[PDB]
Amino acid sequence: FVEDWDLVQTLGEGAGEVQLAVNRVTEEAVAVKIVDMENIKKEICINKMLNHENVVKFYGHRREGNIQYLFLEYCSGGELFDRIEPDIGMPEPDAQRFFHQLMAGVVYLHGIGITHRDIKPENLLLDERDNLKISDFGLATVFRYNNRERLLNKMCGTLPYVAPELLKRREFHAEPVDVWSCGIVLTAMLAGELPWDQPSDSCQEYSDWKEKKTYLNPWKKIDSAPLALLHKILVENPSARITIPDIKKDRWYNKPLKK
Numbered sequence: 001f002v003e004d005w006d007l008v009q010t011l012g013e014g015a016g017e018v019q020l021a022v023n024r025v026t027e028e029a030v031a032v033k034i035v036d037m038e039n040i041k042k043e044i045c046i047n048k049m050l051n052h053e054n055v056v057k058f059y060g061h062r063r064e065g066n067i068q069y070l071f072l073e074y075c076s077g078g079e080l081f082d083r084i085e086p087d088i089g090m091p092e093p094d095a096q097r098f099f100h101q102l103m104a105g106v107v108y109l110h111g112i113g114i115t116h117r118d119i120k121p122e123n124l125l126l127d128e129r130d131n132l133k134i135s136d137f138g139l140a141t142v143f144r145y146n147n148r149e150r151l152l153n154k155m156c157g158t159l160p161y162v163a164p165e166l167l168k169r170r171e172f173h174a175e176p177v178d179v180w181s182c183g184i185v186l187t188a189m190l191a192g193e194l195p196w197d198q199p200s201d202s203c204q205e206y207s208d209w210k211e212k213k214t215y216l217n218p219w220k221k222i223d224s225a226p227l228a229l230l231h232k233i234l235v236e237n238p239s240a241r242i243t244i245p246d247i248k249k250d251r252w253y254n255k256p257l258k259k
């Protein structure tokens with residue numbers, strides 16, 4: 001009976017659906033991604049490579065006909081998105097802890113040559129202890145193989161989170177794009193709002209940021225220390241943008257915080 005699972009509820013939709021399943025014998029819970037049914041093949045393949053505390057674990061996949069069944073780590077705390085109070089954000093110490101965990105997960109992925117490509121609060125899930133877990137590898141790809149980097153050219157992601165070079169350049173490096181989206185996530189956690197619809201020349205809010213008008217929202221709501229880190233992350237030129245090893249040296253990143 002240990003292979004029997006009960007589908008107890010729908011966790012959400014994407015894009016098929018994701019259901020919560022409980023083992024009839026052990027009562028273990030697992031998220032099941034159901035796809036009706038090339039893209040799915042890649043998602044499973046990348047998933048098989050993943051083994052990190054801040055990345056959703058992959059348990060396997062069953063194929064009952066035309067429907068694909070991805071068995072993944074269940075995150076009972078739901079989406080980080082739901083911990084962000086609109087127009088407020090969340091307490092700075094909470095935002096810092098989630099940011100630390102997000103960087104740990106991203107460093108791990110980059111170390112194995114994988115880029116997520118769609119980092120945002122809806123994809124960052126929380127377990128029963130509020131530990132952050134990067135989810136959904138349907139848009140993920142290999143950017144380093146046999147120690148040789150491959151440039152990306154495919155448009156993908158979510159506009160408010162996408163780095164400016166995606167929209168402007170034919171090819172671009174993978175890592176700075178994920179760094180940028182993490183900076184937008186940090187902004188959202190500390191301000192409860194996204195800074196711009198997209199980082200384009202045509203976007204007034206993006207121009208304001210480039211002109212350093214930090215007396216305007218959402219910047220005005222962010223303390224000087226984390227704001228200084230955002231100044232280093234949200235840099236238009238990806239070659240000048242701060243790297244993760246340097247984010248780890250940042251003053252705010254290393255500031256002891258307590259609620």
Ligand SMILES: Cn1cc(-c2cnn3c(N)c(Br)c([C@@H]4CCC[C@H](N)C4)nc23)cn1
Pocket residue numbers: 011012013014018031033056072073074075076077078079122123125135136137
């Ligand atoms: C791909 N994947 C999902 C899971 C997953 C695990 N827990 N979980 C919870 N609690 C919710 Br709410 C969602 C919803 C499922 C619909 C999309 C939402 N972003 C997240 N997905 C999940 C693990 N891997």
